[PDB]
Amino acid sequence: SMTSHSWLCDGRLLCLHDPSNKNNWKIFRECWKQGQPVLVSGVHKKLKSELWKPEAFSQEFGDQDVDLVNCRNCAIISDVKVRDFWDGFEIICKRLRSEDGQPMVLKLKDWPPGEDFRDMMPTRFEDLMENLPLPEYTKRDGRLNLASRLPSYFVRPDLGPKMYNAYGLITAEDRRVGTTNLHLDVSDAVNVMVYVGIPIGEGAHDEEVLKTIDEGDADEVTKERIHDHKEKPGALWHIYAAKDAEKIRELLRKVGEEQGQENPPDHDPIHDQSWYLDQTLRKRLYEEYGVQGWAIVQFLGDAVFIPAGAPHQVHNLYSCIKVAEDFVSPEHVKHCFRLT
Ligand SMILES: [Cl-]
Ligand SMILES: [Cl-]
Ligand SMILES: [Cl-]
Ligand SMILES: [Cl-]
Ligand SMILES: [Mn+2]
């Protein structure tokens, strides 16, 4: 039976089932005012699937110049062609190689660049914006988005959306690395998984994805979405409540000291965007500071709602295309105010 919603993270996470249900707002707002993230599944069934394929990005835009990041070590690969990234998205042997002769795990930095998404890709822009869930919150002019309505006393988000493209992390050592390191935004965000690429050549990588989800501390209902329904998993997220940000700063100041970093006692390890919380650091954050997070697996078509001020990190299990829009809900507008 088609149902309106379910719960993940043992009841701590709302999962809405129909992205276009006009009554979503009634369940959504109860959870959102309490500072929780929310998941909406099925957005991929609303989209034109041919507009979101790696092969088509390569053909249409492959000649543009870009920088990439080597996710394993943060090294910047400068001034290459965007086809150099896309033609290795799913075929491993076509990937740029590091000195060691290994195929690199790469992230495409700032593409499309700045606020250029709509100008470069007007048809993708339309397909996405017309199908975002909770549209009164998420559309540029929605009645519950204050982005277009606030004076300069508030930090207003850029015109989006923004596109997040990166390979999947592979090995046992990769389990300790992030696609996007622990950070926080002053605006709310909605992030949609539009494409998951499962590679080939070194295809038969199914078993280390399971250990990563397991060690990622993912709930039993989430492991059931793989083993029973055969959905494509994209990324492992950890999100923490905005109210826990300072305790996370205290932990990362202590661990920095232990690892011989030399930092002024007020410096902000979350704004630095230099940390990924592996299993050891998450266990410590729980035991030593009493802080619990949400572990979330974003499958193809899953929309993840991130509250303003909430520290979060992302780890791609396979190759992903994500598109994200920033917005300013009344529930969380305190987080972008420039005074007190
Ligand atoms: Cl809040
Ligand atoms: Cl387009
Ligand atoms: Cl709505
Ligand atoms: Cl990062
Ligand atoms: Mn973010």
UniProtKB/Swiss-Prot annotation:
Fe cation binds at H183, D185, H312. Transmembrane segments: none annotated. Changing Y167C: In DIJOS; uncertain significance. It is found in: Nucleus. It comes from the Eukaryota. Residues 121-340 form the JmjC domain. Belongs to the JHDM2 histone demethylase family. Leu-Xaa-Xaa-Leu-Leu (LXXLL) motifs are known to mediate the association with nuclear receptors. Its gene is located in the 5q region of the genome which is deleted in del(5q) interstitial deletion, a frequent deletion found in myeloid leukemias and myelodysplasias, suggesting that it may be a good candidate for the del(5q) tumor suppressor gene. It is linked to Diets-Jongmans syndrome: An autosomal dominant disorder characterized by varying degrees of intellectual disability, developmental delay, short stature, and characteristic facial features such as a wide mouth, a pointed chin, long ears and a low columella. Histone demethylase that specifically demethylates 'Lys-9' of histone H3, thereby playing a central role in histone code. Demethylation of Lys residue generates formaldehyde and succinate. May have tumor suppressor activity. This is Lysine-specific demethylase 3B. The lineage of its organism: Eukaryota, Metazoa, Chordata, Craniata, Vertebrata. The gene is KDM3B. The chain holds residues 1380 to 1717 of 1761 of the full protein.
